[PDB]
Amino acid sequence: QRMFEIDYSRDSFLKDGQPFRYISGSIHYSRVPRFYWKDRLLKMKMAGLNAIQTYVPWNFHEPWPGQYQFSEDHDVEYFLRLAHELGLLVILRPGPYICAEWEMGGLPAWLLEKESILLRSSDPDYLAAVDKWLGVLLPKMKPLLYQNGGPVITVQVENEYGSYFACDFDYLRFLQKRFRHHLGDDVVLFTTDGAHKTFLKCGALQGLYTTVDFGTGSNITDAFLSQRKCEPKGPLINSEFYTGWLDHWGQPHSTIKTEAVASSLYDILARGASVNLYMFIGGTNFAYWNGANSPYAAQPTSYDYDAPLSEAGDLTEKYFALRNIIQKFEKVPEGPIPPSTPKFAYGKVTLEKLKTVGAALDILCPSGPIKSLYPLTFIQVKQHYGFVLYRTTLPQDCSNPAPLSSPLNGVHDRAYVAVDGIPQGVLERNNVITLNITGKAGATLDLLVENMGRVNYGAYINDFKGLVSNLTLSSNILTDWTIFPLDTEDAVRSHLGGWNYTLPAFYMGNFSIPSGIPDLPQDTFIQFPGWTKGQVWINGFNLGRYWPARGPQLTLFVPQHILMTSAPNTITVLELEWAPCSSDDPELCAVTFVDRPVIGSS
Amino acid sequence: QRMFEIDYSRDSFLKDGQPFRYISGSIHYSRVPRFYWKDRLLKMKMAGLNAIQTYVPWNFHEPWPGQYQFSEDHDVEYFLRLAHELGLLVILRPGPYICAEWEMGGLPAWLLEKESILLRSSDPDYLAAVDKWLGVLLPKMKPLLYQNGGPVITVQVENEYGSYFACDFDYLRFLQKRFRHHLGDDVVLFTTDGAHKTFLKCGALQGLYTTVDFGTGSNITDAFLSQRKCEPKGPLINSEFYTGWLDHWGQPHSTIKTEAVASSLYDILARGASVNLYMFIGGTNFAYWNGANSPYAAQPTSYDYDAPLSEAGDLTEKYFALRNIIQKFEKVPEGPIPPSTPKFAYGKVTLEKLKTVGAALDILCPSGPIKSLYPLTFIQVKQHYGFVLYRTTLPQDCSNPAPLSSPLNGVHDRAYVAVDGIPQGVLERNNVITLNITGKAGATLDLLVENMGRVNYGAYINDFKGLVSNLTLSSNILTDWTIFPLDTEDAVRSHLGGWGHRNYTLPAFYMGNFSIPSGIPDLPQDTFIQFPGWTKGQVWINGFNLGRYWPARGPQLTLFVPQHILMTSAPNTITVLELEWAPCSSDDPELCAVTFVDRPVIGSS
Ligand SMILES: *[C@@H]1O[C@H](CO)[C@@H](O)[C@H](O)[C@H]1NC(C)=O
Ligand SMILES: *[C@@H]1O[C@H](CO)[C@@H](O)[C@H](O)[C@H]1NC(C)=O
Ligand SMILES: *[C@@H]1O[C@H](CO)[C@@H](O)[C@H](O)[C@H]1NC(C)=O
Ligand SMILES: *[C@@H]1O[C@H](CO)[C@@H](O)[C@H](O)[C@H]1NC(C)=O
Ligand SMILES: *[C@@H]1O[C@H](CO)[C@@H](O)[C@H](O)[C@H]1NC(C)=O
Ligand SMILES: *[C@@H]1O[C@H](CO)[C@@H](O)[C@H](O)[C@H]1NC(C)=O
Ligand SMILES: *[C@@H]1O[C@H](CO)[C@@H](O)[C@H](O)[C@H]1NC(C)=O
Ligand SMILES: *[C@@H]1O[C@H](CO)[C@@H](O)[C@H](O)[C@H]1NC(C)=O
Ligand SMILES: OC[C@H]1NC[C@H](O)[C@@H](O)[C@H]1O
Ligand SMILES: OC[C@H]1NC[C@H](O)[C@@H](O)[C@H]1O
Ligand SMILES: [Cl-]
Ligand SMILES: [Cl-]
């Protein structure tokens, strides 16, 4: 009964034998609480989109081999059925690598247990893992295919493989074969690459429909000409038409002008091309889900993207402008659009020190440390995200400053250094590979190492994290390590079992919200004036990383559904560098909730 | 164990042996949906108020003798417990007459079944009915008294009795006896009157503590001197310090400057006086609950009052200004204040005519009409609120226009007139007592008569409603009437029977539906409904009577729609009963419509 195909005669899609063109927007279900899925999708539908496009992050669903997460916020099948309910078609991008400014481009860190693994290639062990994953994911997606009564109209294989150095065509052919095994012979499979022959060379494959991506800076004729070299016939497709851009900590917030996005969108649509707006809503990298680029620069917690729907789902002037463009081509749904959420400034909330990381090792590492002659990586100690403590003893007297160094630039990505509980400062990947330290002979040398996000693009996606090479003190290699993987998420859930720099430490405070008020709790934004760099949880939910010292993001988005009115709300901060809490003024040791985000600070 | 008393020695109250003075604000639970009680009460607490003051409208709780309403939106006991739970004290004002720009000052219309009754007096039938009511209400209030562990610290007896002509001191003593009987000998009982000896003369009583009321235009020293003449010792008290004022249809919206309320408040508090701010939130006269003044002028649906909290509960500049003054005397609660609710513009919703009133008679009057030689009042036909259809036959040919008159000005308060389904215009209390009509001999003459609100103040609170005197056609008395009391609320809730029972246009019901999506955390939201092109009538959403609209007069153009009556997925049904002229005749279906907006317009030109 139901069919979706490429017709090579009208340079078109045919949906149930009818000319069809898609106008789609990207929304990542892993970047929006499920509480808000229907809000965002309905806002997208009201804009005149007839489809949405989404990535399936493998590492979001398979945190350990054979251990799966498909419930609640991880319920991709529900997310797709919801889109379908709303009258939206779906362009599925299941990877296995997705890029996406996301931790290791969606690839599970446990792949790195084979240290020599060649990711995104025909490496047999990489293929065997991919095959197992596809064996779990694709039979789920099969009933959601259009032909079987679901919303999924096309499926991307890999993601910009043409940008990767490997150029392993047998890898692409394997994915093609495995996608066909699980999904059948009708589903439209495609690939996406930059709009240039240099990208298309290694990214395009026979039997996979070749599509391009490009933003407002690209000559649209030339871009589609490049697609046409690969596909003389069939629909013109821009799979990621950029509505904005990504950010890095320390760099100015990226924006793209509404007039530019509207102008290019109209041009693309007028050509009869199918198009997807990347991103339509960007949302948030909660917890440790952000990625990074090479040379090492991490993307922030916010994935606002300057998208037409803001981080918290707000209707922007860009939203209305693009809706007006769509309305020139298609009738858009009638009625009022769901509103931007109300925001509430809960105001100042004082915190008090709970414990330093150093004093909390029983709770953070209840299994005990691992001893090693030389340092081990995050992967080797079986921890993928967050923080690992490296401990040794000083082999000599350091009454005069002595150089602590990582000659091979092997602090991945940042270390907070202490000696006998006295903070010495910070080592940084690519920036600070030496720090002068002092302490007595036999003093305890501690390095709290942060994985700031695995690189998600380029050759260096095999990003282990930790002390990945030796440390030297006064030119001598430091040996005899006591390494504590840190169970930060459990420890914060239990209030740490108690159910110029400062030592890394947890600070906690409470605030109440009245019950029986129809419009509370509301969404809010948490700000950290006087703090420096760390992690924040509210009611045990890890909202991400703050870094007001570096910017551009100052505030973090707090969705209302994690806030309660039946018992006090808890806020826990792990501050890594300097806390405003040693002063005699307790009101300084405090966070503030405001009703407007600040993501573009100078 | 717990104690609350007047300390006469030290011109003070004592709460548990400790000096105390109250800073209170009026909230009428009968004018706020219960869905929002905690919201309003918490904002009031956050303003620095340590008590609230409220009226108990008798008619709101006893629609017929022996039939009582104390549940859901009528749950006074719950409201008072909620206030207590928030740490607020309560000054209770149970009447039995409350004035309050409320229908008949709170008195039940069925009191008028005795035509010659003298309300607010020792009239035995009035007292008998008052006694029965107090014996139901006051035992419910007893456990909520401060000394029994509840919030209620003082209780008003009557309401500005000194403004009433009767000056019946037996009546005041009778109330005092009965309040003491039910509530006990410790409760502080007090009266409130205008701050002048001419008012205090008939309002004050030995044994009831005399308080005064006054707003920003009064000299504070003089006002409190007038109290002190009556109460040389004890706390100074302003029981109604006006934050704004009431409206009438056709008059500009009343406002009082923030700076004036703020300055007077500072001066009252600086004297050590206890004070209640009337109103703190005004809210809404939903359904037919509004009052009227004499000479006949009805107050509108909105009771915004220009209060510090707006009709929809919004934090205004006035709110923050008054909080700032209170902060100069007391510590005000810490923490952020619950916000103004979000408002949402659902937009235009088309309606279409369902049925005229004349066509819906079977559903509106399922028990059939009452026949009478001369017209009967609302009270006589056992209808208190809303609309009654009076029908007769023309005794003469009126091919040439013939004058239909109420010679004694007895259309109370408005009549929409039709002859054989042709609208003839409007008869109006005071303003138009004659209307020329045409029709053949034997043609059906209909007058749909609306009760626009029983006068709530003055001598003329015995306001019967309907045709209260004869009609004349060409000077001859019209006889042989068929009178249909109309169950509009029942009929609207059954979609004029469609859902079963589990220049002028004819008065008619117009209906339309709109949907709100489900699964959206922030929908439904509060809204405001506007009626462009409409004239005068009544409005319901999902069977809830939102009140009266009259964009033809103003100043209120929009009506407040609380979000809890709106539903998701299932269509919301809007019913408009238009009385005079609907924008629905033309080939433009788009004109027959209402519009939901996100800002109130209650102060338009
Ligand atoms: C894009 O390139 C084509 C040639 O391929 C040229 O004709 C055109 O001027 C360019 N368009 C724009 C907007 O620069
Ligand atoms: C550390 O101290 C030594 C000797 O004072 C000095 O030469 C060097 O520049 C310092 N190095 C760093 C990395 O601060
Ligand atoms: C550290 O140094 C030792 C001795 O040179 C060497 O065996 C080892 O490869 C190094 N380990 C790391 C993790 O760099
Ligand atoms: C905060 O609340 C938690 C649980 O929500 C409670 O156990 C604790 O006693 C409170 N602590 C403080 C410092 O307010
Ligand atoms: C109010 O009246 C008193 C005398 O009773 C007088 O002293 C004062 O001037 C008056 N106040 C104002 C503001 O006129
Ligand atoms: C009624 O009609 C008469 C003509 O017979 C005219 O004198 C009079 O003004 C009209 N009355 C009204 C109320 O319009
Ligand atoms: C109407 O007129 C008759 C005859 O004069 C009179 O007896 C009766 O009381 C009047 N009724 C009303 C309701 O005015
Ligand atoms: C409005 O909705 C109700 C319930 O679905 C239905 O009975 C009524 O017929 C509806 N009217 C229209 C015009 O849809
Ligand atoms: O936002 C930039 C963008 N580049 C192209 C990739 O395919 C996307 O996942 C992404 O990382
Ligand atoms: O709003 C005016 C105010 N007047 C005095 C009365 O006591 C109140 O009920 C009231 O009507
Ligand atoms: Cl996507
Ligand atoms: Cl009151």
| Close Cβ partners of A460 (under 8 Å, ≥ 6 residues apart) | A294
- Of B459, B487, B515, the position where a domain reaches its end is B487
Q: Which residues of B touch A560 (CB under 8 A)?
A: 521
Can you tell me which residue has the tokens 């703190």?
B280
User: Residue ranges of the alpha helices (H) in B142-219?
Assistant: 169-183, 197-203
Q: How far away is chain A from the Cα of B309, in angstroms, using its nearest Cα? A: 16
State the virtual CA torsion across B548, B552, B555, B560 in degrees, nearest 10. Answer: 40
Tell which residue, A364, A399, A396, A402, has the closest CA to residue A383. A364
C-alpha B560: how far from chain center: 15
Residue nearest to atom 1 of ligand 5 (CA): B219
Residue B207 belongs to domain with CATH number: 3.20.20.80
Residues of B in contact with A36 (CB under 8 A): 521
* Listed residues B277, B298, B328: the one ending a domain: B277
Q: Compute the Cα dihedral for A485, A489, A495, A498 and give only its sign.
A: negative
Mention every residue, 6+ apart, whose C-beta is less than 8 A from residue A331.
none
User: Distance between CA B171 and CA B384 in Å, rounded?
Assistant: 26
Q: Is the CB of B434 under 6 A from ligand 6?
A: yes
Pocket-testing residue among B199, B240, B254, B277, ligand 10, by greatest number of atoms within 8 A of Cβ? B240
CATH number of the structural domain spanning residue A322? 2.60.120.260
Phi/psi zone of residue B594: left (φ > 0), alpha (ψ -120 to 50 degrees), beta? beta
Residues B254, B213, single domain; the answer is yes
b (16+ CB within 10 A) / e for A103-114:
bbbbbbbbbbee
Per-residue tokens: B57: 């409208």
Helix (H, G, I), strand (E, B) or coil at B41: helix
Of B341, B345, B346, the CB nearest to A519: B341
Q: Are residues B447 and B465 in the same domain?
A: yes
Q: Characterize the bridge pairing of strands B152-156 and B89-93.
A: parallel
How is B265-276 classified by DSSP, letter by letter?
HHHHHHTT-EEE
Name the residue among B445, B405, B446 with its Cα closest to residue B428: B405
Which residues does residue B370 pair with via DSSP β-bridges, in sequence order? B483
Task: Kindly state whether residues A235 and A110 are assigned to the same domain.
Answer: yes
How far, in Å, is the centroid of ligand 3 from the Cα of A469? 7
Determine the 3-state secondary structure of B220 from DSSP.
Answer: helix
H or E element at residue B448:
strand B444-450
Domain that holds residue B203: 1-277
Do B183 and B286 lie in one domain? The reply is no
The distance of B410 to chain A (nearest Cα, Å) reads 47
Q: Are both A374 and A443 inside the same structural domain?
A: yes
Q: Rounded to whole angstroms, what are the CA distances from B435 to A337, A492, B403, B421, B424?
A: 49, 80, 6, 16, 8
CB contact under 8 A, B38 and A517: yes
Residues with CB under 5 A from ligand 11 (ion): A 26, 53, 55
- The closest alpha carbon to A234, from A204, A264, A215, A211, belongs to A211
Q: Which residues contact A65 (CB under 8 A, 6 or more apart)?
A: A110, A129, A132
Annotated catalytic residue A160: yes
Q: Coil, strand or helix: which one is A540?
A: coil
Q: What separation in angstroms does the CA of B166 have from each of A91, B172, B201, B318?
A: 81, 11, 12, 38
Is B240 among the catalytic positions? Answer: yes
Please report, for residues A36, A547, B112, B336, B375, the alpha-carbon distance to residue A559 in angstroms, rounded to integers and kept in the order given. 9, 20, 57, 18, 64
Q: Which of A248, A277, A306 is the last residue of a domain?
A: A277
Q: Report the distance separating Cα A591 and Cα A287, nearest Å.
A: 18
**How do strand A534-538 and strand A481-485 relate by DSSP bridges?**
unpaired
Interchain CB distance below 8 Å, B517 and A42: yes
Crossing angle (nearest 10°) for helices A220-230 and A258-270: 40
Q: Which helix (H) or strand (E) holds B77?
A: helix B76-85
Residues A293 and A385 in one domain: no
Say yes or no: CB of residue B474 within 6 Å of ligand 6.
Answer: no
Same domain for B286 and B264: no
CA distance A591 to B90: 37
| CA distance linking residue B42 with residue A520, whole number of Å | 12
Q: Whose CA is nearest to atom 4 of ligand 7?
A: B477
Residue pair B309/B339 in contact (Cβ under 8 Å)? The answer is no
Q: Are A163 and A203 in contact (CB under 8 A)?
A: yes
Do both B37 and B64 map to the same domain? yes
Query: What is the number of structural domains in chain B?
Result: 3
CB atoms within 10 A of CB A71: 9
The answer to whether residues B236 and B308 belong to one domain is no
Alpha-carbon B518 to chain mean position: 34
Co-location of B226 and B212 in the same domain: yes
Residues belonging to chain B with any Cβ–Cβ distance to chain A shorter than 8 Å: 35-36, 38-39, 42, 335-336, 338-339, 341-342, 344-347, 515, 517, 519-523, 525, 563-564
Experimental method: X-ray
Tokens of A323: 């809706």
Q: Which of B38, B344, B515 sits opposite A339 (nearest CB)?
A: B344
Same domain, B84 and B195: yes
Contact criterion met (CB below 8 Å) for B314 and B340: yes
Sheet of strand A505-511, all strands in order from the earlier edge strand to the far edge: A352-356, A505-511, A569-575, A534-538, A541-546
Peptide bond into B279 cis (omega under 30): yes
Judged by CB atoms closer than 8 Å, whether chains meet at B342 and A38 is answered as no
Q: Nearest bound ligand to CA B405?
A: 6
What angle do helix axes A76-85 and A124-141 make, rounded to 10 degrees? 40
**Catalytic residue of the set A5, A160, A311, A450:** A160
Q: Which ligand is nearest to the CA of B494?
A: 8
Gap sites in chain A (C to N > 2.5 Å), preceding residue numbers: 499
Ligand with smallest separation from the Cα of B242: 10
Instruction: Look at A336 and B342 and tell me if their CB atoms are within 8 Å.
Output: no
Residue in chain A lying closest to B43 (CA): A517
Report the residue of chain A nearest B345, measured CA to CA.
A336
Same domain for B474 and B521? no
